[PDB]
Design a protein around this ligand. Structure first.
Ligand SMILES: CCCCNc1cc(C)nc2nc(Nc3cc(Cl)ccc3C)nn12
Lengths: 10, 276
């Protein structure tokens, strides 16, 4: 249930 | 400037349980942490699927300390590399992207102790992680100190209490926010007599005896996290251990085992100055 982290880090 | 928290020591404010630690210098059953109470706490986050891997700690603007078994453990086919992970610093909430507060960093290189013993008892369960670029410190991000021989000698004693933090399991549901618990260091003999596992000098155990009434322990998800103590000499926080392993969580007659950070400091220095 983790919140989407910015794609800039992925 | 390590070990002095922006929201506490630097403002001369005490957190609600540090007095318990100082008074002894003669996560299961823990409580919610206060904001900025452990600015060195790091979360190891897996990219795909998005998930919490382990705890870790910030020891400088470029390095993170954690347990080797969080990255490499052949028995469960666990073998992560730089690009499989993300390091999240300055957090409080386990699942939310705390915008404007936390910092997410990429890894440049992972260093596992050459003699880490995953085959038998997790001896030398320690690893360093070099971030791609320095993290800027703030009210919620600040490194913890590594012990010097003297500090280690006077604080690492049976009866003395340390503090463990983590987002791991609350029972052998996960917490909403960082949890904290203060535990007493246990005499080597008692540690040895509580398990079948061969215990080495690079470990120490902590927890309350079944008769002491109080309880608490680390659990799955907490591994790699810091066991810290506050020095009564210079008021700074020092990381004395790394959450390593335990047989179950908060079981009576059982204790958590931690990697003895000072015993491996030579390797830590070696890796740091030889690589940045
Ligand atoms: C030497 C074998 C120990 C078996 N228990 C294990 C095995 C492995 C691989 N990883 C493990 N991580 C943990 N977490 C942990 C740490 C403490 Cl401080 C207390 C209770 C637990 C849960 N326990 N644990």
């Amino acid at each position: 249930d983790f919140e989407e982290i910015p794609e800039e880090y992925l | 400037d390590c070990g002095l928290r922006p929201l506490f020591e630097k403002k001369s404010l005490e957190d609600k349980t540090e007095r318990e630690l100082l008074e002894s210098y003669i996560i299961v059953e823990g409580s919610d942490a206060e904001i900025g109470m452990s600015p060195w706490q790091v979360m190891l986050f897996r990219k795909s699927p998005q998930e919490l891997l382990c705890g870790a700690s910030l020891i400088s603007d470029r390095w993170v300390l954690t347990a080797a078994h969080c990255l490499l453990y052949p028995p469960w086919d666990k073998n992560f590399t730089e690009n499989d992970l993300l390091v999240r610093i300055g957090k409080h909430s386990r699942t939310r992207y705390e915008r404007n507060i936390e910092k997410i960093s990429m890894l440049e290189k992972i260093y596992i102790h050459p003699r880490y013993n995953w085959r038998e008892n997790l001896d030398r369960d320690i690893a360093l992680m070099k971030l791609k670029k320095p993290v800027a410190f703030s009210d919620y991000i600040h490194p913890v100190c590594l012990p010097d021989r003297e500090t280690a000698a006077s604080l690492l004693q049976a009866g003395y209490k340390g503090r463990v933090t983590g987002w791991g399991n609350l029972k052998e549901g996960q917490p909403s926010v960082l949890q904290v618990v203060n535990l007493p260091i246990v005499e080597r003999p008692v540690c040895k007599d509580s398990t079948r596992i061969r215990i080495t000098d690079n470990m120490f155990c902590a927890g309350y005896k079944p008769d002491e009434g109080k309880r608490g322990d680390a659990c799955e998800g907490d591994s790699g996290g810091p066991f810290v103590m506050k020095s009564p000499f210079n008021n700074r926080w020092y990381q004395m251990g790394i959450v390593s392993w335990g047989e179950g969580c908060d079981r009576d007659g059982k204790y958590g085992f931690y990697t003895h950070v000072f015993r491996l400091k030579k390797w830590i220095q070696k890796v740091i100055d030889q690589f940045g």
